[PDB]
Amino acid sequence: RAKVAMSHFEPHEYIRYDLLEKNIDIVRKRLNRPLTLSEKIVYGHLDDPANQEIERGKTYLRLRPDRVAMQDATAQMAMLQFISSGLPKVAVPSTIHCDHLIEAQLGGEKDLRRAKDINQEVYNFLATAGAKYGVGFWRPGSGIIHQIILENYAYPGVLLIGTDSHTPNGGGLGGICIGVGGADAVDVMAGIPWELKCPKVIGVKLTGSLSGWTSPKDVILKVAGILTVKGGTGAIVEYHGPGVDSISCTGMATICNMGAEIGATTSVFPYNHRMKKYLSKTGRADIANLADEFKDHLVPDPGCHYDQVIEINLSELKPHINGPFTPDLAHPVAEVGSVAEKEGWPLDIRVGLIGSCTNSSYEDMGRSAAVAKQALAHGLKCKSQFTITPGSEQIRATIERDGYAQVLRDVGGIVLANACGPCIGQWDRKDIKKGEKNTIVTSYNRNFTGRNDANPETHAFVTSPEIVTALAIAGTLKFNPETDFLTGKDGKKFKLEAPDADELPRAEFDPGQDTYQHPPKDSSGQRVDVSPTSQRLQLLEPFDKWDGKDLEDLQILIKVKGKCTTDHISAAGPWLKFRGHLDNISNNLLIGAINIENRKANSVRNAVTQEFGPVPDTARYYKQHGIRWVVIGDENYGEGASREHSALEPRHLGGRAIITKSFARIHETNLKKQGLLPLTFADPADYNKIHPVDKLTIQGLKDFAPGKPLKCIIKHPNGTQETILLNHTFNETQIEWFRAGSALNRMKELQQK
Template identity: 50%
Template sequence: MTGTPWELKAPQVVGIHVTGKLNDWATPKDLILYLAGKLTVKGGTGRILEYFGPGIFGQSCTGLATIANMGAEVGATTSTFPYTPSMQAYLHATRRGPVARAADEAAAKGFLNADAGAEYDELIEIDLSCVEPSINGPFTPDLATPLSRFASFVQENGWEDKISASLIGSCTNSSYEDMTRVADLARQAQAAGLSSKVPFLCTPGSEQIRATMERDNITKTLEDVGAVVLANACGPCIGQWKREDTKEGANAILTSFNRNFKSRNDGNGLTMNFLASPIVFKFKPPSGQDLPSSGFALGDLSYEPPPMPDPRPEMNVVIQKDSQRLEVLEPFPSHFKDGTILELPQMKESAPHDHISAAGPWLKYKGHLSNISENLSPCDEAVNDENGEINVAFDHDHGETQPTVDTIPGVAKRFRERGQPWALIVDENYGEGSAREHAALQPRFYGCAMIIARSFARIHETNLKKQGILPLWFADKTDYGRIGSGAVLETIGVHDLISGKPDGTVRVKVRRPGGETFEITTKHTMSRDQLKWLRAGSALNYIRSQLL
């Protein structure tokens, strides 16, 4: 939006050679669920997943979109595919004929496919005929269990073999093809005299899908077996679910969503949320339509702006002074230099972005940073690594004899009020998941200056850089356990880093509350342009300075 160049560290490329044909009950969703189990949530970090081979050409365009959507769950930079006839048909069906024709011309010249003999950093072979429906979870998208072994998996864990709710759609598996295949099963269920015994929620993927579903009686077909067709929005996928059937206690839900971190869907940390294709059933394998025979219905276009609206810089943005939903975003101060920083509690495990900035009811404050920051890391997984307690932090104000115990937001606010920058010490794959900017905005708002991790998820690390927080990697991962709460951290080498003389390392002098002092070595991935953001206090600060 500002014409600012954007850079990306050159990723590795993983080739995924796909052959064979999916069985009747398997879907493209099962392919990515299988791959998530193989790669884990970290296996795609810093890598592009390039799918190729004859098996790709048998998939619908929206099926490939589902695979690409869930590439984020393995940390992939992006997912790429060759240009296929299904993509061409989809572009025409969605009134993007000129794009399809341009792609046709490029493909005719040998582009939009992997180069012949291309070499990859890693090659993965997948025979689609061997891919069976998979159910992944709970609480992580890479715990993959083939459907044939799922019953024993439930029994081994001593779980109740009952589903309390099922949900399909949102940004994943919400295409016309997905909905028509589910509708096929709904007709079979109705013919057998069956209806849904638990809440069954369906979310169309767009206004176009919603309108086309209504026109083609798909909505009515689903409702006839007890489904509730929701608005075309994120909905329960990100916690916008006012759940009435089970508000607390252990239970299991089945969803076709892409993400299943603890507490994500209904705010209940005991809800075991399993990911699956939208057609895990026991009827005749369903058929569906990739594209509607009568074309897509346009739906309500009243919210669409003109393609290239004229700028209107004279317009003032007015926000009510007492608004609890919107506030002006004040520029962050530039505060980083060699000096003294206090440390907040260490966090166990990967701390997904959902556990740094939770979704659900908090999302109504996305435009009000002061309010949403009250939600900094209070979730079930924000574990203090020193005592195992959830959402507990210590303020070792060094004028006091005993540390003050408070919530994580509470201690962060105390630091902010006395102008004390602070740091976080975190574990592997910190910020796992997608790109919730507030997971970086909230700690920055409270004055966090630095985060030292065993490893970062790629998108979250970049978001921290944009907000003026310095992300550092332990050179020796065992140093993670040497730094306790209340330690004073003094950076050595940041002045050289900001001055444009980066050597890839920053030393940190650690002084523990008992007086023990030692140094550790950390690594950084800051580029020259990203160092300009750090120097200015944030990327927005730097962009504004250039525009002025």
């Protein structure tokens, strides 16, 4: 057909819209119905289109992804597991992005300089492993992984998996981009079929057009409030409707990005002209031209069935701000000042932060700059502290050039390195003591306890870049930009005009400096050195095979009550320093979960010594003494981030099974990958029948089978037993992972030794 290349760095890897078409076709003959946009792109990528059992929400699809992307906080451990496989080269186009380890303190190029010193050991590891197995490397400073992917690797009809839960951002350019854990990326780097549970499809119909202060963020802040953090589990959100064409291409990225906060498998928009337009401005107009030739397969079939439909009228949606400690608690910016007052949330804003992969684009910076110059014209500057993060070198270089970075600096903002920064708590923040109650408003996406500054009493609210700027100029949550009046230097009252700005540079993009480094695909005769006395990197030892017997007399490490995020299971911020060292990082295991016994964080009773103390230390004592343990959890356990450390770390400290009401998808797949048993209650009221002092026997592991549940004998200390039933979603692929010890120990047996 045509020979159009996947990117500017892989001139020999072509887009295969001919193969997408071939398979879409084979499949709609078996099914005889309209296919939605995500069914087309997902099923066009099946390993066996003719024989694959397709049932939404029931069957497991064996898929073939087109490329793998890694950020440096999860790449370390994906590559250390790749090194253990023994495979010589990655089998699909893969990238490493160094965005997570650059701490905010001084601003801009000072922090970058300091990050390169402090973390050299790590960047060195990734760079060398990169050159050796054929993975491209984007150096520190390059940008946040999702801006670099939308700018360079994302295209209509791509199936891309990334080791980061915000990978759905790519749906803004018509692809299926799905977040996974390091062991899932190893399968595809190694050449085996990837499995995904067939999703349901929620359709959102957009209507009207966005006006004034309303922007792309408000649509996903309202869908999160409506569907809640557990609403999208097991479904792809498919956007459609007449109002789609009024949203920019980076606006659509904003909305697919934050679909992660409702647990969606991903989100996607259909190929339209705003996408075409953006591909051409990012030098990929040949791709724009080929997607027009394949257009029918990049839009939904007429009359397709959604399992749920929601409709939003863009012309009626007004500004929103979500939180304080969940992103689905939605308020409008018009009563947030009253609900905080009533609810005892701090009213004065200490810091305002625009950035992160959800809101770091040229359009976001320009709409921001436009509230900022109105304030400047009347001689005002920020009452709050103001920080600004650019999405990539290219956005940074271009907003510098078009004048926006200096308006943002003249109102009183500091520009930080092109990196996550304060968003995974890599902030050296010093305006508050620890435990001081305060309010910070961000244009980010999550606002979980202690996530931005390790201070559990920080009240964080998420909103849009232009509203964070209005509220930072004012310093108070009691300020509606639409109604109220500021006071200038002049002596007069003025009101803010709604921001206006271009979706993309009038000129072409200024690309900044060279941050990419291609694999030498010649040399590769590098050794990767991991110091044997290193505190940041450590090679892995395999886990044990299953013994062939049931799990009698299991100790309960903790029964968790309430919300339990992977930011609670394995904290980030200062702990990012140990993302290549399993033993050292295992010392944050569960320190933020609330124990039901005493309502406290990191304080559990050691069964033997009967003293109360830290969760990691009690799990090490149980492991030292031979006691096999379990965790008991509530609903939507493992919510949030995709980091596999939350499943590797209970395996290293002796954990055996985790039992909950429900699981979040990516954490449940990561638990089965590492040899653990994720199990749910067949009746959720049984959670109330298990007390912290009971012992549990999981039984019938010997004839473990898909569809057949497991029995759990709850041994109460008085001599009262009780049998309850536990369901699992394992298919037979997955049961071989468990019997072997981990997915990786299974993969190594298959290499004929």
